[PDB]
Design a protein around this ligand. Structure first.
Ligand SMILES: *[C@@H]1O[C@H](CO)[C@@H](O[C@@H]2O[C@H](CO)[C@@H](O)[C@H](O)[C@H]2NC(C)=O)[C@H](O)[C@H]1NC(C)=O
Lengths: 45, 49
């Protein structure tokens, strides 16, 4: 401002950004096989 | 024929050539176990003023 007049200017700007990603991995597996031969019928137990 | 894995006595025949009392038995086991899993998570956010 100078004689005679008045000027005023205001400017405001803000930004915000956020990102989140999560991934988890877990797995289990197992196999078991077997064979046999055995030479009364009570032994079949 | 004497007592083999059974009662007191059995009776054979002329046509039958043999009766045997030998024990043999076979067994097998093939076990398989599987278990898969999946877990995916995604998130996004955007704000502007
Ligand atoms: C499936 O996955 C599970 C892993 O959690 C395997 O076995 C589990 O073992 C725990 C041990 O304490 C027990 O409490 C669970 O109850 C079991 N799972 C189930 C579903 O009973 C299991 O071997 C895998 N495969 C299958 C179930 O076929």
């Amino acid at each position: 401002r100078v004689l005679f007049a008045k000027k005023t200017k205001v400017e405001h700007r803000c930004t915000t950004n956020k990102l989140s990603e999560k991934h988890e991995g877990s797995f289990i597996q197992g196999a078991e096989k077997s064979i046999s031969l055995i030479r009364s019928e009570y032994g079949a137990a | 024929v004497f007592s083999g894995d059974g009662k007191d006595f059995y009776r054979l025949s002329g046509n039958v050539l043999s009766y045997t009392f030998q024990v043999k038995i076979n067994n097998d086991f093939n076990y398989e176990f599987y278990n898969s899993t999946w877990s995916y998570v995604k998130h996004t956010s955007t704000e502007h003023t």
